[PDB]
Amino acid sequence: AQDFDDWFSSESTEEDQDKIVKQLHTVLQPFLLRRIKSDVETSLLPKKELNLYVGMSSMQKKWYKKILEKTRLLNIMMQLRKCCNHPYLFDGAEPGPPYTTDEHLVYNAAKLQVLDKLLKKLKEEGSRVLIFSQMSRLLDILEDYCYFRNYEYCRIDGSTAHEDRIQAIDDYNAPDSKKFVFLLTTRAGGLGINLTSADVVVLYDSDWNPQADLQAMDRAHRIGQKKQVKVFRLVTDNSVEEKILERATQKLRLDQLVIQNRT
DNA sequence: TCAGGATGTATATATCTGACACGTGCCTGGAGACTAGGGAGTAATCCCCTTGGCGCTTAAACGCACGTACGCGCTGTCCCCCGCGTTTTAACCGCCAAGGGGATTACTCCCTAGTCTCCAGGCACGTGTCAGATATATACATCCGAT
To answer: Which nucleotide is nearest to A188 (CA to C1')?
Structure first.
């Protein structure tokens, strides 16, 4: 790898004039054969994105500052991603006992406040949303929030057997089906699962590996999809999520400069 | 169940002694210079630990059901151990003898350690092998429980 990693001049970024990369274009030419889905009209429909930025909530603003300045408050970087997702995960941020599922849950979640409105705006359009979230515990908050709004939902997350998985996917992929939100996790098993009878997914949380979220949005974008599929990605503002997305971005963009110019 | 005894438990009192107070001499804790080296701060570099997860194999752990054997309660029946009176004898002071042992308090002085300077042999670390010990199967021998 010394002749492969370092010789390539620090990923050919700070010491390249689009020449050494041109060399590697033909270096690994006779080893790979990558053919684009653009050249075939299988999905025959390009995808769409938003990167909507969520003004961070109030009680979250308390916690994020609290985490910084010095309960198992270890691995700080991901802890801040919990605060950026929902403070209710911190065991105590939510109002104490007794426990009720009401609008107070919606207030203390900067993403969910924005997400709630958009979940309404697609209800009238006959869309069915496919939430993909990290930290399966985060699903439980959405699950109960789904229970609060009287929405049709089913869950297929980790620790659910495939026979449970297949009946769950049938409920969503049924003829004249009625499920609106169907929960998963960013991994959600292999590519095999068929979600082409859908039109909108939500990447509630981003990931370090963009390819790990590339195929997840391909779950909807797979073959047979006729209508346009809409993919969301909530991004916390002036927080840890800001740096993760660009970290994914440059790793994502690394693919194009290396692979996406051969064929 | 109630009156009849033996035993601490208080009471007050004369006596012994051993804590408490006081004064001196001596040594050591404090003040004050001087210095040098131990540790605190910095800043590379590599490896491990954390917190979220995800998917898979495969034994253990759990639950359920007979169904014994044993933990427990009762009874009996010794026999052994406790309470009490009676002797008696061994501990416990007091003594005597002489000398040795062990602690101090000086003096003296050899010799054996620490303290340095060089300098090479240990020994630890990073490699590259082989063989001792598994794991399976596989046939063998060898208790255990029911006819």
So the answer is: B54
* Residue owning tokens 């990290």: A134
Which residues 159-188 of A interface with strand B at a CB distance below 7 A? Answer: 159, 162, 185, 187-188
CB atoms near residue A156 (< 10 Å): 22
- What single-letter amino acid sits at A39? D
Strand B closer than 7 A to residue A135 Cβ: yes
**Is the C-beta atom of A78 closer than 7 angstroms to strand B?**
yes
Distance separating alpha carbons of residues A135 and A148, to the nearest angstrom: 21
Instruction: Give distance CA A215 / C1' B139 (Å).
Output: 56
Cβ of A2 less than 7 A from strand B: no
ω into A98 cis (within 30 of 0): yes
* Resolution of this entry, Å: 3.0
- Tell me the technique behind this structure: cryo-EM
Contact, A48 vs A99, CB < 8 A?
A: no
